[PDB]
């Protein structure tokens, strides 16, 4: 009974958009110690770093 005909569907999906953000406070003191450690040498206390 020749009546059949396969069908193919074509759905497309959108991507949407999300994000996550947070704050991370640096104390003047922590970035303080930071500044010397980038140039760590005989100076700049190691226990401090």
């Amino acid at each position: 009974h020749p009546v059949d005909q396969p069908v193919h569907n074509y759905m497309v999906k959108r991507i949407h958009k999300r994000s996550l953000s947070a704050a991370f406070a640096i104390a003047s003191e922590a970035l303080s110690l930071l500044s010397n450690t980038y140039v760590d040498g005989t100076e700049i206390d190691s226990s401090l770093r």
Binding site: E29, S32, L33, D45, S47, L48
Partner: protein
């Protein structure tokens, strides 16, 4: 002109203080410092109260 410049050591200044240096900083507000004794006393009395 140059604002007047010959150095750290040419008359008489360093005993408002004594020292110890203090580089590593970043930890105190009203911490400690000590010693461990006290002030003269008792061999004039009666057989005192």
């Amino acid at each position: 002109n140059t604002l007047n410049f010959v150095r750290f050591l040419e008359l008489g200044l360093s005993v408002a203080c004594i020292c110890t240096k203090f580089p590593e900083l970043a930890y105190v507000r009203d911490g400690v410092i000590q010693f461990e004794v006290q002030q003269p006393m008792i061999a004039r009395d009666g057989p005192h109260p």
